[PDB]
Design a protein around this nucleic acid. Structure first.
Ligand code: MG
Length: 275
DNA sequence: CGACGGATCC
DNA sequence: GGATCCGTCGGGCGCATCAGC
DNA sequence: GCTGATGCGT
């Protein structure tokens, strides 16, 4: 029931070396995460691009340590206007993106701080913090409408292949969480969110990088509730993903789950691409 | 949301 | 009568606001 | 300014 992520594979199936390392992390409160040494772990991981979710932090409140990152000097931040202290995403990059945008169509009016889009030379990167269905599923219908708008937004992008990463807030299949049967009526594992995920993969279209490499591997999770010592018992959920355009699969070296990195109730995930 | 109690099924 | 299904319930976290001093 | 309570989301 415990899990050990396999060693990093830094070579593509055809023998090409990885050239791009992307790390994604739901940090559950950026200021808290930094106090718990999250940035020390980022420095050790040394990614080319770092995507963060649930920053819960407007840009003016960013800790100074974030200014002290020479290898991640291009930084883009989004926080909601009417709900500061919740949501918020960030994208930090070694190289400057060609284009950066926010939201999924109307962010200038519906300032939600959930999505950042960055176009690079060879690919487009989207990072997302997908809305939670909430306790008792009170916001499930909103989540379903959001999924539909997100799907259409990703499909409606004006060429290059897509990388989508972040907290998509759903365990796609039973293998993606410890207690599938007890959670069928809970946020993150309803038939509605599971279906929205399958529709995301088919509509865009996208592949689940981790599952593509490790289709039958159980007990691989990226989230554990703080309650009941769930993490120590690896009672968790896989909520964080790297979804790729089909054309990027031959460039895929590995998709990692960094189970040991502490500082949040999610752990980091890391992608290696040979571009 | 995992732990728990209580019902139901071979 | 062990395994399974199902509904209910308490509670760890971070951050905003507030009361008090 | 600082602490701890409460509310909210989860
Ligand atoms: Mg969270």
């Amino acid at each position: 029931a415990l899990y050990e992520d396999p060693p990093d594979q830094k070579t593509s199936p055809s023998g090409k070396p990885a050239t791009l390392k992307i790390c994604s992390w739901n940090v559950d409160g950026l200021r808290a995460w930094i106090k718990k040494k999250g940035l020390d772990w980022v420095k050790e991981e040394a990614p080319d691009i770092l995507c963060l979710q649930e920053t819960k932090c407007s840009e003016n409140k960013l800790p100074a340590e974030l200014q002290e990152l020479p290898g991640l000097s291009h930084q883009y931040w989004s926080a909601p206007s009417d709900k500061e202290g919740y949501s918020g995403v960030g994208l930090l990059s070694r190289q400057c993106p060609l284009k950066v945008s926010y939201g999924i169509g109307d962010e200038e009016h519906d300032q939600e701080g959930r999505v950042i889009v960055a176009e690079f030379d060879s690919f487009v990167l989207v990072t997302a913090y997908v809305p939670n269905a909430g306790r008792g599923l009170v916001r499930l219908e909103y989540r379903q409408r959001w999924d539909e708008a997100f799907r259409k937004f990703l499909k409606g992008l004006a060429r290059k292949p897509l990388v989508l990463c972040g907290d998509l807030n759903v365990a796609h299949e039973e293998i993606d969480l410890r207690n599938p049967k007890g959670n069928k009526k809970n946020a993150g594992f309803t038939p509605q969110e599971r279906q929205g995920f399958g529709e995301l993969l088919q509509a865009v279209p996208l592949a689940d990088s981790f599952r593509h490499l490790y289709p039958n591997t159980p007990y691989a999770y990226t989230f554990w509730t703080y309650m009941m010592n769930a993490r120590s018992k690896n009672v968790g959920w896989r909520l964080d993903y790297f979804l790729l355009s089909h054309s990027l699969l031959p460039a895929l070296c590995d998709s990692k789950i960094r189970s040991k990195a502490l500082g949040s109730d999610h752990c980091p995930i890391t992608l290696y691409l040979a571009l």
